Design a protein around this ligand. Structure first.
Ligand SMILES: *[C@@H]1O[C@H](CO)[C@@H](O[C@@H]2O[C@H](CO)[C@@H](O)[C@H](O)[C@H]2NC(C)=O)[C@H](O)[C@H]1NC(C)=O
Ligand SMILES: *[C@@H]1O[C@H](CO)[C@@H](O[C@@H]2O[C@H](CO)[C@@H](O)[C@H](O)[C@H]2NC(C)=O)[C@H](O)[C@H]1NC(C)=O
Ligand SMILES: *[C@@H]1O[C@H](CO)[C@@H](O)[C@H](O)[C@H]1NC(C)=O
Ligand SMILES: *[C@@H]1O[C@H](CO)[C@@H](O)[C@H](O)[C@H]1NC(C)=O
Ligand SMILES: *[C@@H]1O[C@H](CO)[C@@H](O)[C@H](O)[C@H]1NC(C)=O
Ligand SMILES: *[C@@H]1O[C@H](CO)[C@@H](O)[C@H](O)[C@H]1NC(C)=O
Ligand SMILES: *[C@@H]1O[C@H](CO)[C@@H](O)[C@H](O)[C@H]1NC(C)=O
Ligand SMILES: *[C@@H]1O[C@H](CO)[C@@H](O)[C@H](O)[C@H]1NC(C)=O
Ligand SMILES: *[C@@H]1O[C@H](CO)[C@@H](O)[C@H](O)[C@H]1NC(C)=O
Ligand SMILES: *[C@@H]1O[C@H](CO)[C@@H](O)[C@H](O)[C@H]1NC(C)=O
Lengths: 46, 49, 219, 46, 164
């Protein structure tokens, strides 16, 4: 499963297994039993 | 349940502990000190001058 | 002068009821058979870890204590007073007389000369024991009033002290004093250390006896 | 009527062991408290 | 300000109150209220008295605390009484019934009938026969005495006769 989107530069630590935050508590969640990789790269030039 | 806990389709005569049992809480209650000093903001928000 | 407590300064260390049992605690107590100062009638004492404080009379010469680190302005302190009316707890920044007292006309209170920035108020022979302690911004006070059949000497016996007050102040304390009613028309000071005791509980739930477990090999 | 120590000792040993078993339900073993309703009230599931 | 009643809005007087919450370094202070509920007795409930949290059945008692004492506990340090902070009455706490379940089988090679024992439970909380070992359901209590066949306990045994 490739989940692809764009976020604010701050809550890149909000995509992680097990956490609390306004991005993680309302718009996207990962289980604490996560197994996979998370890749993030900057974008204001696109 | 006996057949499950004994892991067998045959059981022999006897008495067998199979599970536990317990009564569940019907509801919930809360107790706390009475009400006396709830702050009378009707002096600062209710002044004559 | 100095005197010897015998079994004195035991307080209920929690709110828990207990029927006929023997319960073991670790806390700050006044060790058995201790060396308690004697005062007659007074000066600035230390605090350093809680205080036992008894007193004896039929009149009322002991009229409360004053606490704190500097007993003046520039830092906060407590003040506990009793005129012939009733108790007056108070927490401001004060300016305390170096020899503060109250008279007995019956006009009095040369205690302080300043009451600034008050952060807490409150208004409303004999042997009168008190235990004062100060933990996590709370200033706890235990007390007991037993009747002696003497006038002003420290007796012998067992009597557990019941909690009175609780004040969420935050105040720092390093020193304390006393207040007396002058003449115009006896008290002791122990200190508390971390000990381990064995308290015997009655069937009504009162402490009737105790054992200090660091006195001797038998204990 | 005025000696049964061998019978008293086996009663005492069993009671002393059953009490030690219950008195262990109030040790932390290196945790924040001894109550599960206190770790389930000031900590998130992870 | 010379305030006058025929002034356009934005020149009429407004009263202002500025609340400023501060947190020095004390032990605590003012906080908001907290809803609650009533009290019920003789049922397994989840209680909460001031922070004392547990579950069980609450009855009225014959203890007498000391005016400053707020709850009781026994040897092994379990809470077995409490004071409720509005009536000023002390209440006994009793754990809510529990136990084991055993099934009595005459052997599956003989029948499919079973009886069930609920260990040290009164019969009301679950033909039906009360022993000292618990409550027994599915077995008839005869009056004759045989040799023991399946031990139930406290002097009682069970057996497959005649068919039941
Ligand atoms: C100041 O006092 C007045 C009067 O006691 C309060 O006015 C009440 O407001 C409620 C809700 O708006 C109304 O239902 C009542 O009818 C009002 N009182 C009267 C007598 O009619 C007012 O709430 C108080 N102010 C504050 C901030 O508590
Ligand atoms: C708590 O408040 C209630 C009232 O809000 C008090 O209830 C009264 O209790 C007395 C018994 O002393 C009864 O005679 C009254 O009929 C009760 N009145 C009501 C309205 O319930 C109760 O006593 C208070 N308790 C404490 C400790 O403050
Ligand atoms: C208390 O300590 C002082 C310190 O010098 C000593 O002189 C006195 O004898 C002691 N009193 C007792 C009762 O041990
Ligand atoms: C007793 O002392 C307190 C201390 O401020 C004072 O408020 C009170 O008025 C005094 N009593 C009388 C009768 O004045
Ligand atoms: C305490 O009192 C002094 C002098 O009256 C004053 O300068 C200071 O502001 C007061 N403290 C606070 C927190 O206002
Ligand atoms: C009490 O005094 C000590 C001095 O070592 C200080 O560090 C501490 O902060 C003071 N207490 C409070 C509550 O500030
Ligand atoms: C208190 O204890 C005494 C003796 O232990 C007992 O006789 C009495 O019934 C108890 N209860 C009271 C006095 O209410
Ligand atoms: C069990 O069942 C088998 C098959 O019916 C039978 O041969 C055997 O005798 C039975 N065992 C008994 C009755 O003890
Ligand atoms: C079981 O409950 C009944 C109903 O109250 C009661 O009368 C009885 O004493 C309890 N115990 C036994 C062994 O029956
Ligand atoms: C068993 O015998 C007793 C004799 O005391 C009698 O009361 C009871 O009813 C009998 N029960 C049955 C099931 O026969």
């Amino acid at each position: 499963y490739a989940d692809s989107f764009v976020i604010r530069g701050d809550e890149v630590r909000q995509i992680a297994p097990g956490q609390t935050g306004k991005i993680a508590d309302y718009n996207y969640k990962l289980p604490d039993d996560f197994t996979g990789c998370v890749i993030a790269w900057n974008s204001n030039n696109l | 349940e006996t057949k499950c806990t004994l892991k067998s389709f045959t059981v022999e005569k006897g008495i067998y502990q199979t599970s536990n049992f317990r009564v569940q809480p019907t509801e919930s209650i809360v107790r706390f000190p009475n009400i006396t000093n709830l702050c009378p903001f009707g002096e600062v928000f209710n002044a004559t001058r | 002068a100095y005197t010897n407590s015998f079994t004195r300064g035991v307080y209920y260390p929690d709110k828990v009821f207990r029927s006929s049992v023997l319960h073991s605690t670790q806390d700050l107590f006044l060790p058995f058979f201790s060396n308690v100062t004697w005062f007659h009638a007074n000066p600035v004492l230390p605090f350093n870890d809680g205080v036992y404080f008894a007193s004896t009379e039929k009149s009322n010469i002991i009229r409360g204590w004053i606490f704190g680190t500097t007993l003046d302005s520039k830092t906060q302190s407590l003040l506990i007073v009793n005129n012939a009316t009733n108790v007056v707890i108070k927490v401001c920044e004060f300016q305390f007389c170096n020899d503060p007292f109250l008279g007995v006309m019956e006009s009095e209170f040369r205690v302080y000369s300043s009451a600034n920035n008050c952060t807490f108020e409150y208004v409303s022979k004999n042997l009168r024991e008190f235990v004062f302690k100060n933990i996590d911004g709370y200033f706890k006070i235990y007390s007991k009033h037993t009747p002696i059949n003497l006038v002003r000497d420290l007796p012998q016996g067992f009597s557990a002290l019941e909690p009175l007050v609780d004040l969420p102040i935050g105040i720092n304390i390093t020193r304390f004093q006393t207040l007396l009613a002058l003449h115009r028309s006896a008290y002791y000071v122990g200190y508390l250390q971390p000990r381990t005791f064995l308290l015997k509980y009655n069937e009504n739930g009162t402490i009737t006896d105790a054992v200090d477990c660091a006195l001797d090999p038998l204990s | 009527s005025s000696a049964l120590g061998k019978l008293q000792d086996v009663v005492n040993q069993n009671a002393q062991a059953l009490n030690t078993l219950v008195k262990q339900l109030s040790s932390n073993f290196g945790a924040i408290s001894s109550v599960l309703n206190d770790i389930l009230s000031r900590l998130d599931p992870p | 300000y010379g305030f006058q009643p025929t002034n356009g809005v934005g020149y009429q007087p407004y009263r202002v109150v500025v609340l400023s919450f501060e947190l020095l370094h004390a032990p605590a202070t003012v906080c908001g209220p907290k809803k609650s509920t009533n009290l019920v007795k003789n049922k397994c409930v989840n209680f909460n008295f001031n922070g004392l949290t547990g579950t069980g059945v609450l009855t009225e008692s014959n203890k007498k605390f000391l005016p400053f004492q707020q709850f009781g506990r026994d040897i092994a340090d379990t809470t077995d009484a409490v004071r409720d902070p509005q009536t000023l009455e002390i209440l006994d706490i009793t754990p809510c019934s529990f136990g084991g379940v055993s099934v009595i089988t005459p052997g599956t090679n003989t029948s499919n009938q079973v009886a069930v024992l609920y260990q040290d439970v009164n019969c009301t909380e679950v033909n039906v026969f009360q022993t000292r070992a618990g409550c027994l359901i599915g077995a008839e209590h005869v009056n004759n005495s045989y040799e023991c066949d399946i031990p139930i306990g406290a002097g009682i045994c069970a057996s497959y006769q005649t068919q039941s």
